[PDB]
Amino acid sequence: LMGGFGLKHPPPQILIKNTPVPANPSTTFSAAKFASFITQYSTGQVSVEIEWELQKENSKRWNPEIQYTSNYNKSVNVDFTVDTNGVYSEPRPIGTRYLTRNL
Amino acid sequence: DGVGNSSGNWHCDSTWMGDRVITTSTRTWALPTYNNHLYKQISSQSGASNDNHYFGYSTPWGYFDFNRFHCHFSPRDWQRLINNNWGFRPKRLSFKLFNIQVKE
């Protein structure tokens, strides 16, 4: 209902966790499990690549279509670009339906 | 060949192969008789301005000029070429005259 491609076998979930590292266990033995660990985090790059297939547009309509066009009027901030403080902002939602096929 | 068999088929199409686009266009023309089949020189009437004098000949012949773009490109085919491409140049053309009929 939200949108997109209903799949029976979606791209599988990728779960990730830091392996816990204990911290300074006492010398004498105790059965209770460790309540204290090294405080640590991890970081690194992630690369996702998807190959899309397209349906080429083949039509005979005479007059020109509607297209998605960023307006040419001068403004303080360009759309879809960083501002002066570095905060990237999307100005408006972009639907996918512009080209016109006859019903 | 003959009066009954037609000489050529109407081709008006635009195909976008990949790098190259092939634009075809077909029209129907009508050619009168100019100057009653005789040459004439023409020149500036009496006089008007020094700049506007001209001398030349007017032949009975007539010619085809497809030199404008919109002959070849439909407004939509123009929109595709214009929005998706940096540059375009022509490569080769072919010209065809068919189904001629003379009427008296």
TrEMBL record, chain B:
<protein>
    <submittedName>
        <fullName>Capsid protein VP1</fullName>
    </submittedName>
</protein>
<comment type="similarity">
    <text>Belongs to the parvoviridae capsid protein family.</text>
</comment>
